[PDB]
């Protein structure tokens, strides 16, 4: 057991150590109890998005062009790439971590009941029809 | 001597992929443990990590995408990270289709790391017979 | 030291998946034995059990399903039981190739007999990396 | 070698022991020669369908809806679930342990030569 | 004890399938080395050699052929060990398609042999997420 924000030093179970912040990776453990861990900033194309004692950053995801996704936010050291859909589109999620961009329904032969949301199409009602 | 795990799908719970250890030809040994549907490594080391799933479907009424992913929740990190992942589009008389997915690889892991193996659509899994859905870990 | 087996398909016998111990990259060691097309464990223990098969076809004239299954016939439970199983519908006259690979770790007892078979050997592909193997951990 | 109904105790080659009945699984071996094995009944969703010294029950199968199968008999501790086809149907087996339910062939412009059986369609002259 | 490798696709280099070892959840051990995009065996022996790739596409505009090949350069000519071809397209609604390809086999190898795993059209690979493209070696 180490306190919050700390991890147990791998070579010496007495020394007990500061985790690294989002944006950085463990290059080398704390020399000793007082001192800081040698953490270093993620290279371009990689990131760490939480407190860690990882020895390499994680690879940034790329957006799914096959799903018509578009980059909202580029990758950065403390946050993985953020993907979305163009305006006048909505995410259809197939899985927790897999969605597809579809053009919002304009309500042909009908009235837009609920507006087109981000993760849901226009709840959309027909006129005296079907 | 070495930690090993072979756990299998629960057939009685369709709509969720739930792993079971207490079955003949399912195993959990030498420190491998199963907590909250995740296999848990008992010591730092190299490990063989694998999982199979079998997806069933009767004709292709709606177009589906299936995903199968094994992921690591490390002490060192503490967010879910993909180790092994795959996606399949099995869809364009209702003729039945079967699509297996097997993932396997070798990984450095630390004591307490939690491995998980899940799919997007459990309803499409095939719990007909045993041997068709499993998730396992072997310490090298 | 530890029992191991890596046996491979007999190419000369199409219409049956017959395992061979003396062959292209094939082995049987330290008590592993091959009797009646079944690998036989020489001592209680943990084992890695694996098999691959490769299915070939030119078109899908009549609709095919392929199955591949590894199964255990234990002393402890004297009935054939699935350890690893899979089904595939390869139907896409375009030619097709479909591998199936199974692997897992299992507790086994001396004398347990493992078998690895498919439903339609005629669809197998003489080409060697059809194999069935067992490694004592 | 142990007698009928018995298995050799794994930890002690002298003690030699009563197998367990269909419906139960070996929780623990006989302490010694006179005594009985600690065998216990299968939990719901599992079963053992023969004399055994298995350390857990096997998982019940479920029927294949994708193949239009129907439950003949439910699972129980001493017997796995039993699947089949509706009446006016026949099993077509793709593997030893995989069949599909198909509607029997009615013999249009013809005479039913052999009737529709369980695992075979109507031999049918037209 | 035994040499093992699990390397993964570089997402940062689209248009080439470049393997990475210096990465979380990518591994290189017990003599396995990675030089010039090729895994290099540290001793004569039997090896499990495996690779997975995931090919993506949105509808089928042009008809494509995909190949995935693992090959051996023994210590002085390259030999195919594992190969597969896929025509995911109709040659005819633009629905997205996914085509995974897994190759694996056991091979006798000699110290210094260099294994390579490549595809014909990297542009079609799916570097969206991690776990989808890997190349690995395990000494039996
Ligand atoms: C389809 C197949 N073909 C195989 C061929 C060989 C082995 C294999 C061979 C040796 C081995 N060792 C080396 C000796 N010590 C223990 C681990 N572990 C696994 C596994 C094989 N598998 C299954 C498999 C593939 C990829 C990763 C892991 C796999 O096995 C899984 F069950 F761990």
Author numbering:
A (entry chain E): 14 to 143
B (entry chain B): 10 to 101, 109 to 156
C (entry chain C): 10 to 101, 110 to 144, 147 to 156
D (entry chain F): 14 to 139
E (entry chain A): 10 to 84, 87 to 103, 109 to 156
Text of the article:
The mechanism by which TNF induces signalling across the membrane is poorly understood, however, it is generally believed that the process involves receptor clustering. There are currently five approved TNF biologics that work by completely blocking the interaction of TNF with its receptors but to date, there are no small molecule therapeutics available that disrupt the high-affinity TNF–TNFR interaction. Small molecule inhibitors of TNF are described that stabilise a distorted TNF trimer, reducing the affinity of TNFR1 at one binding site and effectively reducing the stoichiometry of receptor binding from three to two per TNF trimer.
In order to further understand the impact of our compounds on receptor binding, we have crystallised mTNF with and without compound (UCB-4433) in complex with a truncated form of hTNFR1 (residues 41–184). The crystal structure of compound-bound mouse TNF (mTNF) in complex with humanTNFR1 (hTNFR1) reveals a distorted mTNF trimer with two copies of hTNFR1 bound. The degree of disruption of one of the receptor binding sites in the mTNF(UCB-4433)-TNFR1 structure was such that only two receptors were bound. Significantly, receptors that were bound were dimeric (described in detail below). The degree of shift was measured for a number of amino acids that are involved in TNFR1 binding and the displacement ranged from 6.2 to 7.8 Å, making it impossible for the receptor to bridge across and bind the two monomers simultaneously, as observed at the two other binding sites. The individual monomers maintain their fold upon compound binding (RMSD of 0.5 Å), so the relevant positioning of residues involved in receptor binding within each individual monomer remains largely unchanged. It is, therefore, possible that receptor could still bind (albeit weakly) to either monomer A or C, however, this was not observed in the crystal structure suggesting that receptor binding prefers contact with adjacent monomers in the trimer to form a stable interaction.
